[PDB]
């Protein structure tokens, strides 16, 4: 053939891939975390948006820290050979480096480690996207007038 | 012969390190509603980093908190793109 270039990810596998949406709205009372009003609007919007990008969307609601870790473990052990990419959306409370299950925190590193190149071989060289709506601390941006 | 195990991840954070992130109880979160809008408008047109840059500008310019509590009133937000990707990402092909 003619000259070839390799600057863009191959996105024409038979499937775009999974879009896992974790929508944590209601938290165990003992945690003292407030309900996240408006998050269902987010989850519905994301489902429709990634549906139209041809992702296989899976919505999950109000998962404990244990359920989050097992879900990511299970998904990372699927065969993604026929999939172009992987997307995970996390909607929850958080702080720096952490997102909350309904009953306590999960290290973001624990979640993303399942998809490491050496731990998820069928996603090697494929884009792995983590979209995180959660706090990263308690600082507030006062802004500056333009 | 090897690639880094941390290669080919992208973290689209709603907010900068150390900061709160804002969610409207009626409209949804500033970041997710801007992200979906820009994906809707530009996923057949722009590379993903340029889409997320439009998301940064939308959140930065169009949103400001309203609160009866002076501590939480009139605050702004910038999202935070963290890319370990090794190639451009287009959601379309051919």
């Amino acid at each position: 053939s003619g000259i070839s270039l390799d600057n863009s990810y191959k996105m024409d596998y038979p499937e775009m891939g999974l879009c896992i949406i974790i929508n944590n709205k209601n938290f165990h009372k003992s945690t003292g975390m407030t309900s996240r009003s408006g998050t269902d609007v987010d989850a519905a919007n994301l489902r429709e948006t990634f549906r139209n990008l041809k992702y296989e969307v899976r919505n999950k609601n109000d998962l404990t820290r244990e359920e989050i870790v097992e879900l990511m473990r299970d998904v990372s052990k699927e065969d993604h050979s026929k999939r172009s990419s992987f997307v995970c959306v996390l909607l929850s409370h958080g702080e720096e480096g952490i997102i909350f299950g309904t009953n306590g925190p999960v290290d973001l590193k624990k979640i993303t480690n399942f998809f490491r190149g050496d731990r998820c071989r069928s996603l090697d060289g494929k884009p792995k996207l983590f979209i995180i709506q959660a706090c990263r601390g308690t600082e507030l941006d006062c802004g500056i007038e333009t | 012969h090897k690639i880094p195990v941390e290669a080919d991840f992208l973290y689209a954070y709603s907010t900068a390190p150390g900061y709160y992130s804002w969610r409207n109880s009626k409209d949804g979160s500033w970041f997710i509603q801007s992200l979906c809008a820009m994906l809707k408008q530009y996923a057949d047109k722009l590379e993903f980093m340029h889409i997320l840059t439009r998301v940064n500008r939308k959140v930065a310019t169009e949103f400001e908190s309203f609160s009866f509590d002076a501590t939480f009133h009139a605050k702004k937000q910038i999202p935070c793109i963290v890319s370990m990707l090794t190639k451009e990402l287009y959601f379309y092909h051919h």
Partner: peptide, 4 residues
């Protein structure tokens, strides 16, 4: 407007 609420924080996360």
């Amino acid at each position: 407007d609420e924080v996360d």
